[PDB]
Write an enzyme that holds these catalytic residues in place. Structure first.
Site, PDB file in Angstrom:
ATOM      1  N   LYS A  53       0.829  -1.197   0.000  1.00 36.75           N
ATOM      2  CA  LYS A  53       0.000   0.000   0.000  1.00 36.75           C
ATOM      3  C   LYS A  53       0.863   1.246   0.000  1.00 36.75           C
ATOM      4  O   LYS A  53       0.610   2.180  -0.770  1.00 36.75           O
ATOM      5  CB  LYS A  53      -0.958   0.011   1.190  1.00 36.75           C
ATOM      6  CG  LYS A  53      -1.974  -1.137   1.185  1.00 36.75           C
ATOM      7  CD  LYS A  53      -2.816  -1.247   2.482  1.00 36.75           C
ATOM      8  CE  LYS A  53      -3.684  -2.497   2.430  1.00 36.75           C
ATOM      9  NZ  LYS A  53      -4.712  -2.606   3.525  1.00 36.75           N
ATOM     10  N   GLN A  97      -4.688  -1.404   9.634  1.00 33.89           N
ATOM     11  CA  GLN A  97      -4.581  -2.731   9.040  1.00 33.89           C
ATOM     12  C   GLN A  97      -5.167  -3.794   9.971  1.00 33.89           C
ATOM     13  O   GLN A  97      -4.900  -3.801  11.178  1.00 33.89           O
ATOM     14  CB  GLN A  97      -3.126  -3.059   8.717  1.00 33.89           C
ATOM     15  CG  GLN A  97      -2.999  -4.322   7.862  1.00 33.89           C
ATOM     16  CD  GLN A  97      -3.357  -4.081   6.386  1.00 33.89           C
ATOM     17  OE1 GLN A  97      -3.512  -2.930   5.947  1.00 33.89           O
ATOM     18  NE2 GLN A  97      -3.470  -5.168   5.615  1.00 33.89           N
ATOM     19  N   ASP A 120     -11.008   2.752   4.086  1.00 28.94           N
ATOM     20  CA  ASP A 120     -11.341   1.328   4.043  1.00 28.94           C
ATOM     21  C   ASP A 120     -12.803   1.056   3.723  1.00 28.94           C
ATOM     22  O   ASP A 120     -13.121  -0.037   3.253  1.00 28.94           O
ATOM     23  CB  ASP A 120     -10.977   0.660   5.367  1.00 28.94           C
ATOM     24  CG  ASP A 120      -9.643  -0.087   5.291  1.00 28.94           C
ATOM     25  OD1 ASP A 120      -9.424  -0.769   4.264  1.00 28.94           O
ATOM     26  OD2 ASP A 120      -8.820   0.011   6.241  1.00 28.94           O
TER      27      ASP A 120
HETATM   28  N1  LIG Z   1      -7.691  -2.128   7.145  1.00 28.26           N
HETATM   29  C1  LIG Z   1      -7.490  -3.206   6.199  1.00 28.26           C
HETATM   30  N2  LIG Z   1      -6.960  -4.369   6.588  1.00 28.26           N
HETATM   31  C2  LIG Z   1      -6.813  -5.332   5.687  1.00 28.26           C
HETATM   32  N3  LIG Z   1      -6.246  -6.610   6.054  1.00 28.26           N
HETATM   33  C3  LIG Z   1      -7.191  -5.111   4.352  1.00 28.26           C
HETATM   34  N4  LIG Z   1      -7.031  -6.118   3.303  1.00 28.26           N
HETATM   35  C4  LIG Z   1      -5.768  -6.113   2.572  1.00 28.26           C
HETATM   36  O1  LIG Z   1      -4.907  -5.331   2.831  1.00 28.26           O
HETATM   37  N5  LIG Z   1      -5.589  -7.111   1.556  1.00 28.26           N
HETATM   38  C5  LIG Z   1      -4.435  -7.271   0.706  1.00 28.26           C
HETATM   39  C6  LIG Z   1      -4.160  -8.539   0.206  1.00 28.26           C
HETATM   40  C7  LIG Z   1      -3.076  -8.732  -0.639  1.00 28.26           C
HETATM   41  C8  LIG Z   1      -2.286  -7.645  -1.002  1.00 28.26           C
HETATM   42  C9  LIG Z   1      -1.112  -7.895  -1.939  1.00 28.26           C
HETATM   43  O2  LIG Z   1      -0.228  -7.112  -2.026  1.00 28.26           O
HETATM   44  N6  LIG Z   1      -1.139  -9.134  -2.703  1.00 28.26           N
HETATM   45  C10 LIG Z   1      -0.123  -9.575  -3.632  1.00 28.26           C
HETATM   46  C11 LIG Z   1       0.925 -10.394  -2.907  1.00 28.26           C
HETATM   47  C12 LIG Z   1       1.897  -9.588  -2.060  1.00 28.26           C
HETATM   48  C13 LIG Z   1       2.451 -10.554  -1.019  1.00 28.26           C
HETATM   49  N7  LIG Z   1       3.443 -10.324  -0.103  1.00 28.26           N
HETATM   50  N8  LIG Z   1       3.620 -11.450   0.618  1.00 28.26           N
HETATM   51  N9  LIG Z   1       2.766 -12.347   0.168  1.00 28.26           N
HETATM   52  N10 LIG Z   1       2.026 -11.834  -0.846  1.00 28.26           N
HETATM   53  C14 LIG Z   1      -0.764 -10.563  -4.599  1.00 28.26           C
HETATM   54  O3  LIG Z   1      -1.868 -11.108  -4.301  1.00 28.26           O
HETATM   55  O4  LIG Z   1      -0.175 -10.837  -5.691  1.00 28.26           O
HETATM   56  C15 LIG Z   1      -2.553  -6.372  -0.506  1.00 28.26           C
HETATM   57  C16 LIG Z   1      -3.637  -6.181   0.345  1.00 28.26           C
HETATM   58  C17 LIG Z   1      -7.717  -3.884   3.998  1.00 28.26           C
HETATM   59  O5  LIG Z   1      -8.033  -3.701   2.853  1.00 28.26           O
HETATM   60  N11 LIG Z   1      -7.858  -2.974   4.956  1.00 28.26           N
END
Ligand SMILES: Nc1nc(N)c(NC(=O)Nc2ccc(C(=O)N[C@@H](CCc3nnn[nH]3)C(=O)O)cc2)c(=O)[nH]1
Ligand SMILES: NC(=O)c1ccc[n+]([C@@H]2O[C@H](COP(=O)([O-])OP(=O)(O)OC[C@H]3O[C@@H](n4cnc5c(N)ncnc54)[C@H](O)[C@@H]3O)[C@@H](O)[C@H]2O)c1
Ligand SMILES: NC(=O)c1ccc[n+]([C@@H]2O[C@H](COP(=O)([O-])OP(=O)(O)OC[C@H]3O[C@@H](n4cnc5c(N)ncnc54)[C@H](O)[C@@H]3O)[C@@H](O)[C@H]2O)c1
Ligand SMILES: Nc1nc(N)c(NC(=O)Nc2ccc(C(=O)N[C@@H](CCc3nnn[nH]3)C(=O)O)cc2)c(=O)[nH]1
Lengths: 292, 290
Positions: A53, A97, A120
Site C-alpha cells: 500500500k 490494518q 477502508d
Molecule cells: N484495514 C485493512 N486491513 C486489511 N487486512 C485489508 N485487506 C488487505 O490489505 N488485503 C491485501 C491482500 C493482498 C495484497 C497484496 O499485495 N497481494 C499480492 C501479494 C503480495 C504478497 N506479499 N507477501 N505475500 N504476498 C498478490 O496477491 O499478488 C494487498 C492487500 C484492507 O483492505 N484494509
C-alpha cells in the site's frame, strides 16, 4: 484454455489514472493527499500488504506514513492515536490494518476513524450506505473484484454468481455489489448470487458453482474450487491468499486444473491482491477531494 | 401432504411473551412502553396494517397513537413531526408507515427517526449493524420470517435457501439473517442463500429452487412459486401480499400444498408475524438495551 487476467497489469494501469488525477488535484493548488496506515503487531502478511500500500502511494504521488505499534498496545491507546490522526488536517486518509489482537475490538476501531478519512469503507455508516445502494466509500478488495469483472467485460446481469465466503470485509460486500440493482446511486451487478460459507457442504457448493457464470472464492482454503465444480467458459476470481508448502502461495482455486475449464481465471499471486492496493489509492484521492 | 404453518398462532405466542415481559417491566416500577405510528395518506392496506399494529400493542400492554397526515404533506413538515416525537420522552418507539408519497424521500425520513426509537430497524446505523451481525433492531417482516422458521423447528444450518426479492426492507435483510453466522452477536441461520430478483430468468430461478430446502418469496408477484420449482418436502414461506381477483401471496398455494413439506398461507401467514415482532422491538426500545 482460460484467459489469465493479470491483476498486476490492471492495477498498474489504474494507479496511472490515480497518479494523473492527483497531480491535477495538486496543480489546481490543493494539498497533496496524505495516507496514514496504522499497523499493530507483527503478522508477516500484514506487513507485506501495508508495504505494498505504501509503495503504491509513492507511485501515485500520495504522501504516506506507516505507524507501527506493538500488539500489546491497549484499545484506548489505539483510539487516542486514531483521534490524533482524525484531527490532523494534513491526514486525508486513515486506515488500520486488520486483523487486530483479540483485546482490540475491530468494529470500535473501525468506527472511530473519521468517516471522511475512512478509506477502508469499514465505518458502520459507510457499511449501511453500501448496503442501501447509496453513494458510499467502497471497500478496496470487493471493489477490486468488481473492477476485474467490469474492466474485463464479463457480464453480470441475469448471470449466476457464487461467492464462497461471507466475511463482512470481503465476502459480504462482494455479494452485495454483484446482486444489487444497476439503477441505484451506487449501481450493482444485477446477478443472482449464492452466498456459501464454512457450513456449506462441499457437495452443495458444487451443486451451485456448476450453475455459475462467475465463481468468486474468498474462503481461505486451498483447492476449495476445482475444475469439476466449474461450468465451462465461466469466470473464476480467486480472492484467497494462502501460505502453503519450502513456503509458497496459492489461492482457493486449483489454478492449473481450473485453467483448462474456465473461460477466465485470476492467478495468485498477482491477481486480486494488487487490485486491492489500486482501489485503495482511488479511495484516498476520493477522500482527499471530500466528495462523499 | 404439506403442513400449513399458522402465522396467527405463532404470533399469538410471541405476543403473549411480550405482554408477559411488558407486565414484568411495569411491575418493577418502569414506565409503560409507548409506540407512535405516523401514517401518511389513504393507502387502504397501510391503514389496515397500522390498525393491526395498534390493536396488537393494546393487548400486550403497550400504549400507542396513530398520527395521520394527508398525502399532500410536505417532507419538511413530516421531519418536524418526527423531530418532535424524537424529543417526546414518553415515546419509546417511533415508526413511519411505508410507502410514502412520491414527493417524499423515504430514505431521508427513515434516517430522521432517532435510532434508539427506530423500532423498524430502518435507520442507516441499524441497517449497517444488522449487516455486520451486531445487536440491532431487526426489521419486523424479516424477523417474522426468521421466527416462523426457528419456532417451527425447520433447520437452516447447512441448508439451501433461495430468497426471491432484494428489497432493502424485506428481501435483503431476510437473506442477511439467513446466511450469517450463528455464533455472532446477532446470530444468523448459517444457510446457503441464493438471492434472486427481477433480472433473474425463470429457468435460473427454478434451477436454484429445486435445490432449495427453504424457498422464501418476497417479490410481490402472484403465482411466482409453482410446484415444479419446489423439491419434495421443502419449506415454502410466502412473504408477498398480492391483491389478485381476493388476496394471495407469491406462491401457488394449492399446488405447492402438494409438493412442499411446510407452507405458509396468505393471509394469516407472515402478515401476523410482522405485527408480532414489532411488539418485541417496542419492548426492546423501551428497555433502552442499545
Ligand atoms: N484495514 C485493512 N486491513 C486489511 N487486512 C485489508 N485487506 C488487505 O490489505 N488485503 C491485501 C491482500 C493482498 C495484497 C497484496 O499485495 N497481494 C499480492 C501479494 C503480495 C504478497 N506479499 N507477501 N505475500 N504476498 C498478490 O496477491 O499478488 C494487498 C492487500 C484492507 O483492505 N484494509
Ligand atoms: N486482496 C486480496 O486478495 C485479499 C485481502 C484480504 C484477504 N484475502 C483472502 O480472502 C478471504 C477473505 O476472508 P477473511 O480472511 O476476511 O475471512 P475469515 O478468515 O474471517 O473467514 C473466511 C471465510 O471463509 C469461509 N469459509 C470457510 N470454510 C469454507 C468452506 N469450506 N466453504 C466455503 N466458505 C468457507 C468462512 O465461512 C468465512 O466467511 C480469505 O480467504 C483471505 O485469505 C484476500
Ligand atoms: N409493503 C408491505 O407492507 C409488505 C409487507 C410484507 C410483505 N410485503 C411483500 O414483500 C414484497 C417486497 O417488499 P417491497 O415492497 O419493499 O419490495 P419492491 O416492491 O421494491 O420489490 C420487490 C422485489 O421483487 C423482486 N422481483 C421482481 N421480479 C422478480 C422475479 N421475477 N423473480 C424474483 N424476484 C423478483 C424485485 O427485484 C424486488 O427486489 C412486496 O412486493 C410485498 O408483496 C409487503
Ligand atoms: N414503516 C413500515 N412500513 C411498512 N409498510 C411495513 N410493512 C408492514 O407493515 N407489512 C405488513 C403486511 C401485512 C400485515 C398484516 O397484518 N397482514 C395480515 C392481514 C391480511 C389482510 N389485509 N386486509 N385484510 N386482511 C395477514 O397477511 O394475515 C402487517 C404488516 C413495516 O413493517 N414498517
Amino acid at each position: 484454455e482460460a484467459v489469465v487476467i493479470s491483476g498486476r497489469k490492471l492495477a498498474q494501469q489504474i494507479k496511472q489514472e490515480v497518479r494523473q488525477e492527483v497531480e491535477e488535484w495538486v496543480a489546481s493548488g490543493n494539498k497533496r493527499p496524505h495516507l496514514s496506515v496504522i499497523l499493530v503487531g507483527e503478522n508477516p502478511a500484514s506487513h507485506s500488504y501495508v508495504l505494498n500500500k505504501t509503495r503504491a502511494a509513492a507511485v501515485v504521488g500520495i504522501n504516506s506514513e506507516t505507524i507501527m505499534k506493538p500488539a500489546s498496545i491497549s484499545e484506548e491507546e489505539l483510539l487516542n492515536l486514531i483521534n490524533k490522526l482524525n484531527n490532523d488536517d494534513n491526514v486525508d486518509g486513515l486506515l488500520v490494518q486488520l486483523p487486530l489482537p483479540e483485546h482490540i475490538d475491530e468494529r470500535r476501531i473501525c468506527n472511530a476513524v473519521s468517516p471522511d478519512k475512512d478509506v477502508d469503507g469499514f465505518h458502520v455508516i459507510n457499511v449501511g450506505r453500501m448496503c442501501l445502494d447509496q453513494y458510499s466509500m467502497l471497500p478496496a478488495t470487493p471493489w477490486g473484484v468488481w473492477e476485474i469483472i467490469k474492466r474485463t467485460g464479463i457480464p453480470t446481469l441475469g448471470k449466476n454468481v457464487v461467492v464462497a465466503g461471507r466475511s463482512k470485509n470481503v465476502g459480504m460486500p462482494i455479494a452485495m455489489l454483484l446482486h444489487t440493482d444497476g439503477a441505484h446511486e451506487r449501481p450493482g451487478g444485477d446477478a443472482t448470487v449464492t452466498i456459501s460459507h464454512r457450513y456449506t457442504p462441499k457437495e452443495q457448493l458444487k451443486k451451485h458453482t456448476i450453475l455459475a457464470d462467475i465463481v468468486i472464492s474468498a474462503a481461505g482454503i486451498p483447492n476449495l474450487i476445482t475444475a469439476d465444480m466449474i461450468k465451462e467458459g465461466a469466470a473464476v476470481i480467486d480472492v484467497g491468499i494462502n501460505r502453503v508448502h519450502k513456503p509458497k502461495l496459492v489461492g482457493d482455486v486449483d489454478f492449473e486444473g481450473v485453467r483448462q475449464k474456465a473461460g477466465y481465471i485470476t492467478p495468485v499471486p498477482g491477481g486480486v491482491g494488487p487490485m486491492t492496493v489500486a482501489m485503495l489509492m482511488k479511495n484516498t484521492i476520493i477522500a482527499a477531494k471530500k466528495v462523499l
